[PDB]
Write a protein that binds this ligand. Structure first.
Ligand SMILES: CC1=C(/C=C/C(C)=C/C=C/C(C)=C/CN)C(C)(C)CCC1
Length: 140
């Protein structure tokens, strides 16, 4: 069965600038963010999912139950609040983020040693791929 648990290092990050612009992330933060190559530390614990998006400058932490709508605090990205639901779709994890922006959400899946993440908002698509890695680093 699909299990996202692991430590994952960014390999590619496609169209991130336009995704951030569509979120109205401020220009100075977009400049910082485009230099970053975040890791993902994921623990899948039953249907309790923790996805830590870790970078040298700032983190974004998700901690939620699959299937259950929750208030998602996007402080550090666009500082918005969404009413967010993450659901299994076969071997894919689907996320809908209800809020100010239309069409906001993402899909996550695994191909071999790769974690694939398609992020969407306002018809814009950013695609990230990470490689599963084994050398760990301490974090908060
Ligand atoms: C814009 C910005 C950032 C953007 C983070 C983003 C979009 C995280 C998306 C997380 C998702 C869908 C995770 C599901 N694997 C960092 C990495 C927190 C650094 C500070 C500035």
């Amino acid at each position: 069965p699909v299990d996202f648990t692991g430590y994952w290092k960014m390999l590619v990050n496609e169209n991130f600038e336009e995704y951030l612009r569509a979120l109205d992330v401020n220009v100075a933060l977009r400049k910082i963010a485009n230099l970053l190559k975040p890791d993902k530390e994921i623990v899948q614990d039953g249907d309790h999912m923790i996805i830590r998006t870790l970078s040298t400058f700032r983190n974004y932490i998700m901690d939620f139950q699959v299937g259950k709508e929750f208030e998602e605090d996007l402080t550090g990205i666009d500082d918005r609040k969404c009413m967010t639901t993450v659901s299994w779709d076969g071997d894919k994890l689907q996320c809908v983020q209800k809020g100010e922006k239309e069409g906001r959400g993402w899909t996550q899946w695994i191909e071999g040693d790769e974690l694939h993440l398609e992020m969407r908002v306002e018809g814009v698509v950013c695609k990230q791929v990470f490689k599963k890695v084994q050398h760990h680093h301490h974090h908060h």
